[PDB]
Design an enzyme around this catalytic site. Structure first.
Site, mmCIF file in Angstrom:
data_model
loop_
_atom_site.group_PDB
_atom_site.id
_atom_site.type_symbol
_atom_site.label_atom_id
_atom_site.label_comp_id
_atom_site.label_asym_id
_atom_site.label_seq_id
_atom_site.Cartn_x
_atom_site.Cartn_y
_atom_site.Cartn_z
ATOM 1 N N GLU B 62 0.818 -1.129 0.140
ATOM 2 C CA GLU B 62 -0.047 0.023 0.013
ATOM 3 C C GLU B 62 0.730 1.368 0.169
ATOM 4 O OE1 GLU B 62 -1.798 1.882 3.446
ATOM 5 O OE2 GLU B 62 -3.703 1.539 2.554
ATOM 6 N N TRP B 84 -8.841 -1.553 -0.398
ATOM 7 C CA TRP B 84 -9.204 -0.235 -0.934
ATOM 8 C C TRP B 84 -10.320 -0.715 -2.129
ATOM 9 C CZ3 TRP B 84 -8.486 4.856 0.064
ATOM 10 C CH2 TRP B 84 -7.544 5.157 0.924
ATOM 11 N N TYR B 110 -4.468 9.854 -0.750
ATOM 12 C CA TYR B 110 -3.210 9.889 -0.276
ATOM 13 C C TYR B 110 -2.338 10.039 -1.386
ATOM 14 C CZ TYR B 110 -4.819 8.240 4.206
ATOM 15 O OH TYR B 110 -5.572 8.152 5.382
ATOM 16 N N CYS B 170 -6.906 9.574 7.203
ATOM 17 C CA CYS B 170 -6.955 9.455 8.148
ATOM 18 C C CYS B 170 -5.704 9.750 9.056
ATOM 19 C CB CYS B 170 -7.163 7.826 8.323
ATOM 20 S SG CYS B 170 -7.887 7.043 10.010
ATOM 21 N N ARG B 190 -5.849 11.134 12.935
ATOM 22 C CA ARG B 190 -7.056 11.921 13.737
ATOM 23 C C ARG B 190 -7.977 10.835 14.373
ATOM 24 N NH1 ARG B 190 -11.154 10.392 11.177
ATOM 25 N NH2 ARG B 190 -11.524 9.846 9.104
ATOM 26 N N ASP B 193 -8.413 2.845 15.505
ATOM 27 C CA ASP B 193 -8.946 1.656 16.112
ATOM 28 C C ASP B 193 -7.691 0.862 16.691
ATOM 29 O OD1 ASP B 193 -11.496 -0.243 16.324
ATOM 30 O OD2 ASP B 193 -9.868 -1.456 16.191
#
Lengths: 282, 283
Positions: B62, B84, B110, B170, B190, B193
């Site tokens: 990724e 994704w 991104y 994120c 931000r 989990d």
């Protein structure tokens, strides 16, 4: 619980006990990555071990809300902190010749209410242009307080070159739980000596103001640092400050009910119980 | 010396004792805490959590995908990483008003923000050369010319482009620091989990900090993970408690098999995680 100010001080000790020596030089002990949390529940984080320029804090913030990028507009209120970067001389040393004196460029004010809009000058009207982050933030707090995307970012890689001074306030996030509003600030660079204290006050004030308008109670304020440093010129003064004992934090009061974030006025705020220690030299 | 994964499990412990109930976008309850920070040494070891396996192939593949500036989920799916695809499907795109986008087109996510920040986005097949700010390369340039600079930021939060992508970034932004020939990095997430994504994230930027160090010829320093909304699903409390009891094993080691000089020249075959033995699955 431990007096909140102890965190700021607890950090100054670290910067000295583990800071490594290294524009304009002047020397500095730096550290990378720190985080301090200050409570806003029935108290305001206005350091007492050293007096803080409250008028500067309050008057500058209101200056951001307006979206003003004019150093003068803020100095005309007695706060001359942004004038240096507005002087005809400085603007020149940056290639900004066509630039009028007092024009800082797309700094905080512009980024907060017109993010993305093409910058011209401080006089131009950018109404309806860009993204009003400050307002969108308020709006989300109100309709979806559980949102984890409540972020306000002043770091625009595309406008950095046009700025008279890069942000030291990349971004800040808001959090709402149990009717309490929290804010986290991420400072890329922090001058522990003459900046952080002002910065703490600055964002804690904003949280109050926002909490007031969203009908919430202030909670915590997390101050996260990227590069925290101490200028050698302060190695002594601060060494004296650490000696001092932190006095109970003051209280902030909003003397009147306000609807929109822009309707806030300086007279609307009051600092009660602020008993800071003397002031030597720094 | 205190093990590094203890910092992680410690945050899970904090969430358990001090976190409060907070609902997510679907109404699902989570135990949350706002504002967290952890430091992970990248010195002669790589922080790939061991009290629970981490999908390394996904991390590595990724990351490579981001560097290319790709916004086509297909290009990633054709590598085994299917993380994704859901956000790029035909049905999920329509429901967002992107009926005119070809399957796979994620929007200015991104990859696009790193290599072309501020550029006008069209589609996953448009050419954006010279368009936007190549923050990634700018970082590498700064680390080389002015290592003491403290404005080495790579921000992915673009308020203007937010409503054009599947979901908000994120990883708001990250900052690089250089001291004594060591490259440290700090990431601002931000939302996170703790048990499902934070691990993956730690590995992503630890690996990126390894690549940038390699290119600028520096040694990996530390990785500061700063979280905003740290949380765990309530229905995940029990299994997490079990994992907490586990004893973390030595972090593996990452190796760059060949010598790379350009960030875009990195290939998946150039990496090797030697010594990775995570505990068995738990539930």
């Amino acid at each position: 619980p431990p007096h909140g100010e102890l965190q700021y001080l607890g950090q100054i000790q670290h910067i000295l006990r583990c800071g490594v020596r290294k524009r304009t030089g002047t020397g500095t002990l730096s550290v990378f990555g720190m985080q301090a949390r200050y409570s806003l529940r029935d108290e305001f984080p206005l350091l007492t071990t050293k007096r803080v320029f409250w008028k500067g804090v309050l008057e500058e913030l209101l200056w951001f809300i307006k979206g003003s990028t004019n150093a003068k507009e803020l100095s005309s209120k007695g706060v001359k902190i942004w004038d240096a970067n507005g002087s005809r001389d400085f603007l020149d040393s940056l290639g900004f010749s066509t630039r009028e004196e007092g024009d800082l460029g797309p700094v905080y004010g512009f980024q907060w209410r017109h993010f993305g809009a093409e910058y011209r000058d401080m006089e131009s009207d950018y109404s309806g242009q860009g993204v009003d982050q400050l307002q969108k933030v308020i709006d989300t707090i109100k309709t979806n307080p559980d949102d984890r995307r409540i972020i306000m970012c002043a770091w625009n890689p595309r406008d950095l070159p046009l700025m008279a001074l890069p942000p030291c306030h990349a971004l800040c996030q808001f959090y709402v739980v149990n009717s309490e509003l929290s804010c986290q600030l991420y400072q890329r660079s922090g001058d522990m000596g003459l900046g952080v204290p002002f910065n703490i006050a600055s964002y804690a004030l904003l949280t109050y103001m926002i909490a007031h308008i969203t009908g919430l109670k202030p909670g915590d304020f997390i101050h996260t640092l990227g590069d925290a440093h101490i200028y050698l010129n302060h190695i002594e003064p601060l060494k004296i400050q650490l000696q001092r004992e932190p006095r109970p934090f003051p209280k902030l009061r909003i003397l009147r009910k306000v609807e929109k974030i822009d309707d806030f006025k300086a007279e609307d705020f009051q600092i009660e119980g602020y008993n800071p220690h003397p002031t030597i030299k720094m």
